[PDB]
């Protein structure tokens, strides 16, 4: 596998978004992964609608602004036959009426693939060969709230009880040895003001820190 990967350098990632006061991180993680797969398939980077997901995927088991799961969103895109663009179905941060329009669809998936649970080596392989991957993590910590630089490592992090969906856009390492002080490059959905331009480096190969490889998945396009 590559020693480092950064899909943002290849045009697969949109600018950082902000979920505001709505528990829709799961939807932002989902669109970020679909945005990268659509980019890989067509060479066109188009911002997708997290609102489409919030308002229309309750049948798949999502709960709009009260939470959800990336696999359930990819399932919604599959069953639904499409997903509209951010431009056509804007984000308002509140649960609203489903207004999915097939004519404005700019993405589709035939389902999704799951990364073997708890396997950081497996997630590394998915990131290197597919593109950005949706992952769940335990972000309920003040240290995460106030993160700004460096490799994030929090003793209270759990690898099992997770509460936030994010996007792994690559991985790297500090220094010259590609074998130590490794980290996952993660895109958050709390605006570009949070963290480092909206991103955070999370400790990699430190026992599935914060559960990054516990429930990873990506849409099949
Ligand atoms: Cl959330
Ligand atoms: Cl999921």
Author numbering: 1 to 221
Task: Copy text verbatim from the article accompanying this structure deposition.
Addressing the elusive specificity of cysteine cathepsins, which in contrast to caspases and trypsin-like proteases lack strict specificity determining P1 pocket, calls for innovative approaches. Hence, we set out to determine the crystal structures of cathepsin complexes with representative peptides of cleaved substrates. As a working model, cathepsin V was chosen because of the resolution of diffracting crystals (up to 1.3 Å) and crystal packing with accessible active site cleft. Reactive site mutants C25A and C25S of cathepsin V were used in structural studies.
The pattern III group (binding shifted to the primed side) consisted of structures of eight non-protected peptides that all bound uncleaved into the primed sites. Electron density maps in the region from P1′–P3′ and partly P4′ of molecule A enabled an unambiguous interpretation. On the non-primed side, the MPD molecule occupied the S2 site, and the CL- anion occupied the same position as the carbonyl oxygens of P1 residues in pattern groups I and II. Its negative charge appeared to mimic the absent negatively charged SG atom of the reactive site cysteine.
